[PDB]
Design a protein around this ligand. Structure first.
Ligand SMILES: *[C@@H]1O[C@H](CO[C@H]2O[C@@H](C)[C@@H](O)[C@@H](O)[C@@H]2O)[C@@H](O[C@@H]2O[C@H](CO)[C@@H](O)[C@H](O)[C@H]2NC(C)=O)[C@H](O)[C@H]1NC(C)=O
Ligand SMILES: *[C@@H]1O[C@H](CO[C@H]2O[C@@H](C)[C@@H](O)[C@@H](O)[C@@H]2O)[C@@H](O[C@@H]2O[C@H](CO)[C@@H](O)[C@H](O)[C@H]2NC(C)=O)[C@H](O)[C@H]1NC(C)=O
Ligand SMILES: *[C@@H]1O[C@H](CO[C@H]2O[C@@H](C)[C@@H](O)[C@@H](O)[C@@H]2O)[C@@H](O[C@@H]2O[C@H](CO)[C@@H](O)[C@H](O)[C@H]2NC(C)=O)[C@H](O)[C@H]1NC(C)=O
Ligand SMILES: *[C@@H]1O[C@H](CO[C@H]2O[C@@H](C)[C@@H](O)[C@@H](O)[C@@H]2O)[C@@H](O[C@@H]2O[C@H](CO)[C@@H](O)[C@H](O)[C@H]2NC(C)=O)[C@H](O)[C@H]1NC(C)=O
Ligand SMILES: *[C@@H]1O[C@H](CO[C@H]2O[C@@H](C)[C@@H](O)[C@@H](O)[C@@H]2O)[C@@H](O[C@@H]2O[C@H](CO)[C@@H](O)[C@H](O)[C@H]2NC(C)=O)[C@H](O)[C@H]1NC(C)=O
Ligand SMILES: *[C@@H]1O[C@H](CO[C@H]2O[C@@H](C)[C@@H](O)[C@@H](O)[C@@H]2O)[C@@H](O[C@@H]2O[C@H](CO)[C@@H](O)[C@H](O)[C@H]2NC(C)=O)[C@H](O)[C@H]1NC(C)=O
Ligand SMILES: *[C@@H]1O[C@H](CO[C@H]2O[C@@H](C)[C@@H](O)[C@@H](O)[C@@H]2O)[C@@H](O)[C@H](O)[C@H]1NC(C)=O
Ligand SMILES: *[C@@H]1O[C@H](CO[C@H]2O[C@@H](C)[C@@H](O)[C@@H](O)[C@@H]2O)[C@@H](O)[C@H](O)[C@H]1NC(C)=O
Ligand SMILES: *[C@@H]1O[C@H](CO[C@H]2O[C@@H](C)[C@@H](O)[C@@H](O)[C@@H]2O)[C@@H](O)[C@H](O)[C@H]1NC(C)=O
Ligand SMILES: *[C@@H]1O[C@H](CO)[C@@H](O)[C@H](O)[C@H]1NC(C)=O
Ligand SMILES: *[C@@H]1O[C@H](CO)[C@@H](O)[C@H](O)[C@H]1NC(C)=O
Ligand SMILES: *[C@@H]1O[C@H](CO)[C@@H](O)[C@H](O)[C@H]1NC(C)=O
Ligand SMILES: *[C@@H]1O[C@H](CO)[C@@H](O)[C@H](O)[C@H]1NC(C)=O
Ligand SMILES: *[C@@H]1O[C@H](CO)[C@@H](O)[C@H](O)[C@H]1NC(C)=O
Ligand SMILES: *[C@@H]1O[C@H](CO)[C@@H](O)[C@H](O)[C@H]1NC(C)=O
Ligand SMILES: *[C@@H]1O[C@H](CO)[C@@H](O)[C@H](O)[C@H]1NC(C)=O
Ligand SMILES: *[C@@H]1O[C@H](CO)[C@@H](O)[C@H](O)[C@H]1NC(C)=O
Ligand SMILES: *[C@@H]1O[C@H](CO)[C@@H](O)[C@H](O)[C@H]1NC(C)=O
Ligand SMILES: *P(=O)(O)N(CC)CC
Ligand SMILES: *P(=O)(O)N(CC)CC
Ligand SMILES: *P(=O)(O)N(CC)CC
Ligand SMILES: [Cl-]
Ligand SMILES: [Cl-]
Ligand SMILES: [Cl-]
Ligand SMILES: [Cl-]
Ligand SMILES: [Cl-]
Ligand SMILES: [Cl-]
Ligand SMILES: [Cl-]
Ligand SMILES: [Cl-]
Ligand SMILES: [Cl-]
Ligand code: NA
Ligand code: NA
Ligand code: NA
Lengths: 527, 527, 527
């Protein structure tokens, strides 16, 4: 039996055998009042205190969210869909601890991605029991509200202030500050880590005054708040909040009434209308996301970044070789996960319309000009490869590289990885290559489970990443020091050295996508 | 009469005339509950508080330990054997203070060596009364548990967690923090010093979070935790703990039962079985030593060193010219302290088997290749000299130099000495040269006692070391500033300047054993 | 009426018109219990607290001391003799404050010289009322015990520990810490300043842990503790304490009895015997001075200096062009203040015997060799000029320059002056030039009093020094910023830039007495 006393009550966890050893798991600990009724659209309210033993023995409800129905029965897509009931009562977290109870363990806090519209901490690829077993860190993950329920904004007004779901993450970092010593954890050594929108989240907690003292270091996998999808403008957020009201017949004139009306709606009615709050979107649409709210976020975060207004600490930042591909089967003409997707120039062109909706014509010609100077015009997969690079360079790679540069210019050590390994078990076709989202199972150690059909070179690869991730968290330095590993150089403006992660040989390289990102970074923002 | 009040009671010391002056000595102060019965194999438990006057007027019991019986009647060996009764009730320490009571004296804390299997603070060569008299520092030394009683590990389990004897040292550093002002000492100026395993101990307290604030500076004589004998793996420690159980019929299945059974054994039964817990060992075997326990030591200490996770302070680190020789008479074919020990190539070869038991054949050829490229093949003492260099370079010299480099790369001043003087009174034969263990009597000032048959050049030599050791402790700088002495340069990576200590002329040199240690350090760890 | 409340009682001061303005003066405030009877030879004991108003309206008793009787009626000498009654009850201080009461004034604390055998704070040349009026700083000065009464040492024993008179200064710095806000002063901005032995005193408070937090900055005029006269060895101090006992029939065998006997002696008997505690001395003899006592001074102060163990702060350090001359009329053959003192080679030689008593013959030839390589052998005042340079270079100039170098090597700003102006009113003859002691009246502003027969160029010169001294104290930078003054560069090892102070033009120069001090500094200490 394993009972830990927390500030709000006792909690019982469960034992798990992992690799001939044991991890204790406390799945489903609540960390705020359920955000129902009067609390819907508001900042999470702190938790009341319960006598008796809360049983943390299974994953909790995931937050309400639309589901990916594009490929029913297909594991590639459905592995991302929620795997516990949806409910507004989803404000729970998970703790995994080494056995025996560590004395003062480093803490890794996972923040999932999903475009801020979806996702859940209980996915199999986010299971932190391998990290606990293997590295003897503590792993914490949390559910936070996504979609309108988590990010609806009517700026300035506490009935729907914006950013609630970032406040959910925050209040969870707080629970770790107050509660994690009880579990053997060191609150003074906490590293946040997250992928995609979860990484953008990590980057904004680097910017948020309220989060500054709730963690030590940050890891950002395929995401940063300067990505084009990551922050909704005040303009767009209002449009969207009013468009939502309109669609649920909740148009009022007293904004406080719009909200009271929206709180009478039922979760499905709200969910059902999210996709149409925008005239057009893309497979990468973030209808309801982070906004400048004057609370969590005090100013446009591009301004905060440029002017050095963020927590000073080491960062680890990374991306995957084919970020963009996964999106092309969600609406680009001629693409399919069921064939090789050789598209035409005219298809490439119609695809830019898919991903770059408004979108001066000259903007889009400029993307075509930059990405279609073939070397040479012979290769039939030319336009298929260009569309994916366009999508992942614009959306992930250049914004992560620009974040890393700017961040590092203020004096902190920063390490950048280029993930190039395609999973031996990937269900998506070969042409989609090293996809967005598919480093996560390496980071979490799923390939250390031999029962599991990954190659030997994949176990070794993941053991190494685990070790680098954990050394980063405990010591601010992502080195694997024991096995004659390539040394991971800090990333500096000027050199921009990054490390490549793959099964064959890892390399030190410089200036990832220098030519592409000059385009996205200097020129495109102008169109 | 001299009574000092301590946090746990009053203690009476004794006066001593040293060099027409007086030192007060408090020999035998207890610093923890005796670790008997239920407490055997556990972390030292703090001391209860006694009214009345504890009389600190003689050395206490030494901890239980096997004794060196190889050379009965021989002073060279027997000078290291314990000289007070053995008992498990050995958790005592010694304080020597200048007379008159100093006002705020610097404190030198001695930690003896002995492979972690033996040794005691009451040896004549560890008598700190000369340091007190001559330099007006306070000298503290402590007994701590050695062998299985002090280092038996069944990882994670507080009935035998590992590292108890390092916890004994720690709790002693604590007693100095709480108690040494009473004696005229400055708790804010404490330097740890120790030889061989005692030096490895000093280097791990540099790594232990719990020791960080219990001292100021460190001196490491012929030892550091990166030496090959200094840390037992988790693998090996379990094997050994189970092998011990097995040999005492204490095999159980409930590890807590293995321990309860071992606590019924009597000290001799335990001692008697230690040597055989390993299929083979060497004269340098450390059967039960420090382990990564997640308490004292939080991670492999090579990783902590590499990644800069240690207390930031000055270090003084040293070795002797012939570290290896002393070991060759304990099992290498053709060696003897009673003749000149000219061995053959085939003897050298059988000796590598002695010292490098498992031990790829190619590993050992590689040592032979590196160490037998004669210049030239004429000299009959060629192979005798090579075996000792092999042993001392592998075991002491290169690991001390690598520790010093790595430590210094994080910004702290570090000073390295090469001790080259052979004692005029050495009982071991000439060929064993400047032996391991034989700087200690110079450090402790025994040659300042003229009654004593050391040469004049030896008094001068020791007066100088005493002065450098004491300046290091008080001021972080091991200079002898008054007598036109060679200035001792800091040790930097890049230059690796070290100072030679001998009667004739001391020198500044660079890169001690550069070629040898490239071998031990880059190549050998691979075999 | 002007009453200020202090921690021990109220004190009444007196108003003074200075330069059409007003300064309040509190002359004679006690700062410790009188050190009579049982207290003779002991550390000053803190003051009891008095109700009623202590009247601070005249200077107090000077401490017991031998008087200079060499030139009765002669103002040059007698200006240094005490000008208030001698008594053991002399532990008093003086405060001068600007009117109106300043708000948070910088404090200058004066410590007089006199070889540690003589002197008093109430001399006319130490009158701080001009500084208060002109610069609106507060001036504090204190009497402290000199001779055996202030520095008798029987090392380790609190009945006569040594350094009492340095403890008197200290307890006075303490009174300023506790009391000076009451007077409008800032305890957090205190600069110690002093001349000759008073400067050596300032330099040892830079070395004393107990003084570290009782002041901010230091000024040292013609003196530093590394001067050859400034610290008595333990050897010599004992000899001298026993020689004193012997001469007063107080030889005992119980050192505590020697002291009790000495405390029965009457001040004159003690004073009368001081000069003979040494087989021979010189005009520069310091029979009873500072010793290493393990309390005020924890180690030889040369060692503390070399190894950087002193308060880190700015220093201002200076000397006069003819330091040595004043001493030559006190015992060197052929010298007289009443003629031009052209001495012969053989006289020069007998003079070295005067100043360098024991004193290898080769030591003295070496001084002659260094100082008599004439350029050229024609000039009749050659040997007269050489003897004075010998005396002032050995005793003052090189030790002040070496202090300044060593001090500055630890990172602090340091400024060095060369004082070259001879007072228009000097009573000593011309050949004695710019004498020791004769910058003081410029520092204290006596030439700002026009009533007073100094030239115009002297008023201007002193106004400037006052301004530089005061800017140093308030701002750590001795600049005169308003009147196109030469800028005073910091003194660095390497450049050794110093500023010359004279009526004509002040200069920046480098490496004062480079050739002379190489001699005193590297070579002579060897003989
Ligand atoms: C800000 O919002 C308006 C609202 O338009 C929307 O009505 C919503 C409830 C929803 O159904 C949505 O799909 C619909 O478009 C946007 O105005 C629309 O913009 C497009 C192109 O400009 C027009 O074709 C529509 O006719 C027009 N609708 C109305 C009623 O005015 C507006 O575009 C939007 N801003 C953006 C581009 O985000
Ligand atoms: C690769 O497949 C795409 C996707 O479209 C198809 O999916 C196939 C696997 C198959 O079931 C097909 O019937 C289904 O429609 C093909 O793109 C499609 O091209 C067809 C040919 O006319 C058009 O009718 C569709 O508009 C277009 N689909 C869309 C909406 O994008 C593609 O042609 C095929 N190409 C290959 C084999 O390279
Ligand atoms: C881990 O321990 C086993 C235990 O073997 C030992 O049994 C002990 C109680 C003790 O007496 C010891 O001397 C003895 O060897 C080791 O297994 C042994 O290894 C050697 C060489 O591999 C074999 O020749 C033995 O037959 C074998 N014994 C058994 C019973 O299996 C094992 O080697 C050890 N690991 C190491 C190398 O440290
Ligand atoms: C130096 O002595 C060694 C040690 O062995 C011997 O000790 C001697 C002092 C003597 O008492 C001798 O009888 C004792 O055995 C000698 O090595 C030994 O060589 C002998 C010769 O056959 C062998 O029998 C032994 O196996 C071997 N001893 C071991 C176990 O190492 C050595 O030969 C001698 N050599 C010299 C003089 O250089
Ligand atoms: C340490 O002190 C002794 C004491 O000698 C002195 O006796 C004193 C009371 C006083 O009167 C003093 O003038 C007198 O000299 C010194 O011993 C003396 O040293 C000189 C030269 O060495 C001799 O000529 C004296 O005869 C001798 N006196 C005795 C009785 O031994 C000693 O020199 C001194 N150390 C120094 C040099 O400071
Ligand atoms: C400068 O005067 C010195 C000091 O000696 C004398 O002081 C004079 C002013 C005068 O009163 C004189 O009588 C008095 O003795 C002279 O040195 C002296 O030289 C004389 C000449 O024989 C010697 O007798 C003395 O030993 C010596 N005095 C001492 C003890 O130092 C000096 O000669 C005179 N020289 C000049 C004018 O340059
Ligand atoms: C646990 O260690 C605490 C501090 O450890 C951290 O220091 C931080 C500044 C940060 O660098 C982390 O990465 C370090 O690991 C210490 O103060 C606590 O007292 C310790 N608590 C225990 C052992 O109970
Ligand atoms: C004794 O001195 C104390 C501090 O001295 C030390 O400062 C440390 C930081 C370290 O550098 C040591 O090497 C120094 O010697 C001081 O704070 C205490 O108050 C003093 N205690 C006394 C005199 O009772
Ligand atoms: C008086 O000023 C105080 C501090 O002034 C000094 O700061 C010191 C660090 C030192 O640099 C000095 O040279 C500065 O002048 C301030 O804290 C006090 O509160 C002030 N007191 C008053 C006005 O009553
Ligand atoms: C918690 O789980 C344990 C299972 O042993 C049990 O005490 C109880 O059923 C649980 N409490 C509940 C269901 O609230
Ligand atoms: C709008 O009416 C609502 C009813 O609750 C209230 O929240 C708010 O005060 C009103 N705002 C104004 C002043 O129109
Ligand atoms: C280090 O090496 C060993 C053996 O070569 C291997 O089993 C392990 O996976 C490696 N550890 C890390 C941290 O990669
Ligand atoms: C401590 O030693 C002294 C010796 O004078 C004495 O009081 C007593 O015998 C001792 N106390 C003991 C033996 O416990
Ligand atoms: C093993 O039995 C012992 C008896 O004390 C006890 O320490 C421990 O709880 C048991 N472990 C288990 C659960 O098997
Ligand atoms: C310094 O020198 C003296 C005399 O030459 C000598 O007696 C002493 O041993 C030396 N001191 C040190 C610290 O070596
Ligand atoms: C202090 O001086 C004043 C002068 O006005 C007066 O009150 C009194 O005589 C003095 N107190 C004394 C002499 O103790
Ligand atoms: C010496 O006798 C005196 C008398 O007061 C005393 O101070 C001291 O204790 C004695 N010292 C010794 C132990 O001889
Ligand atoms: C500055 O100049 C004026 C006029 O030229 C002069 O009266 C005064 O003495 C000077 N002040 C200082 C600080 O030297
Ligand atoms: P991520 O959370 O997967 N996301 C960024 C918007 C890609 C849809
Ligand atoms: P040291 O304690 O003498 N030792 C290191 C293991 C040599 C046996
Ligand atoms: P100073 O105090 O005048 N002094 C140094 C000893 C010269 C006599
Ligand atoms: Cl091509
Ligand atoms: Cl690698
Ligand atoms: Cl690239
Ligand atoms: Cl040869
Ligand atoms: Cl030397
Ligand atoms: Cl070498
Ligand atoms: Cl000439
Ligand atoms: Cl000027
Ligand atoms: Cl000069
Ligand atoms: Na363009
Ligand atoms: Na090799
Ligand atoms: Na010379």
């Amino acid at each position: 039996d394993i009972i830990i006393a927390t500030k709000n009550g006792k909690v019982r966890g469960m034992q798990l055998t992992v690799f001939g050893g044991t991890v204790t798991a406390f799945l489903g600990i609540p960390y705020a009042q359920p955000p129902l009724g009067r609390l819907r659209f508001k900042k999470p309210q702190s938790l009341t205190k319960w006598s008796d033993i809360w049983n943390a023995t299974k994953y909790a409800n995931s937050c309400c969210q639309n589901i990916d129905q594009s490929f029913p029965g297909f594991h590639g897509s459905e592995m991302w869909n929620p795997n516990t009931d949806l409910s507004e009562d989803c404000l729970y977290l998970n703790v995994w601890i080494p056995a025996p109870k560590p004395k003062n363990a480093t803490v890794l806090i996972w923040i999932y991605g999903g475009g801020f519209q979806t996702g859940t901490s209980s996915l199999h690829v986010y299971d932190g029991k391998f990290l606990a077993r293997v590295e003897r860190v503590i792993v914490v993950s949390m559910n936070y509200r996504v979609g309108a329920l988590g990010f609806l904004a009517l700026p300035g007004n506490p009935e729907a202030p914006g950013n609630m779901g970032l406040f959910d993450q925050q209040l969870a970092l707080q629970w770790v500050q107050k509660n994690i010593a009880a579990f053997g954890g060191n609150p003074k050594s906490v590293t946040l880590f997250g992928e995609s929108a979860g990484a953008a989240s990590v980057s904004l907690h680097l910017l948020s005054p309220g989060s500054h003292s709730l963690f030590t270091r940050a890891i950002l996998q395929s995401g940063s708040f300067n990505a084009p999808w990551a922050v909704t403008s005040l303009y767009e957020a209002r449009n969207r909040t009013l468009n939502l009201a309109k669609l649920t017949g909740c148009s009022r004139e007293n904004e406080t009434e719009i909200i009271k009306c929206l709180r009478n709606k039922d979760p499905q009615e709200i969910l059902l209308n999210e996709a149409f709050v925008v005239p057009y979107g893309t497979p990468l649409s973030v209808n309801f996301g982070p906004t400048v709210d004057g609370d969590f976020l005090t100013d446009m975060p591009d301004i905060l970044l440029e002017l050095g207004q963020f927590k000073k600490t080491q960062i680890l930042v990374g991306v995957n070789k084919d970020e963009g591909t996964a999106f092309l089967v969600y609406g680009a003409p001629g693409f399919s996960k069921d064939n090789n997707s050789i598209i035409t120039r005219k298809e490439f062109q119609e695809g830019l319309k898919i991903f770059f909706p408004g979108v001066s014509e000259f903007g889009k010609e400029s993307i075509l000009f930059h990405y279609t100077d073939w070397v040479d015009d012979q290769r039939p997969e030319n336009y298929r490869e260009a569309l994916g690079d366009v999508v992942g360079d614009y959306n992930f790679i250049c914004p992560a590289l620009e974040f890393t540069k700017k961040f590092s210019e203020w004096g902190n050590n920063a390490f950048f990885y280029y993930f190039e390994h395609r999973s031996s078990k990937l269900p998506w076709p070969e042409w989609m290559g090293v996809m967005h989202g598919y480093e996560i199972e390496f980071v979490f150690g799923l390939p250390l489970e031999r029962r599991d059909q990954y190659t030997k070179a994949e176990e070794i690869l993941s053991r190494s990443i685990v070790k680098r991730w954990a050394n980063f968290a405990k010591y601010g330095n992502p080195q694997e020091t024991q096995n004659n590993s390539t040394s991971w150089p800090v990333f500096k403006s000027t050199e921009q050295k990054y490390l490549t992660l793959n099964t064959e040989s890892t390399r030190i390289m410089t200036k990832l996508r220098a030519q592409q990102c000059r385009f996205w970074t200097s020129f495109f923002p102008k169109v």
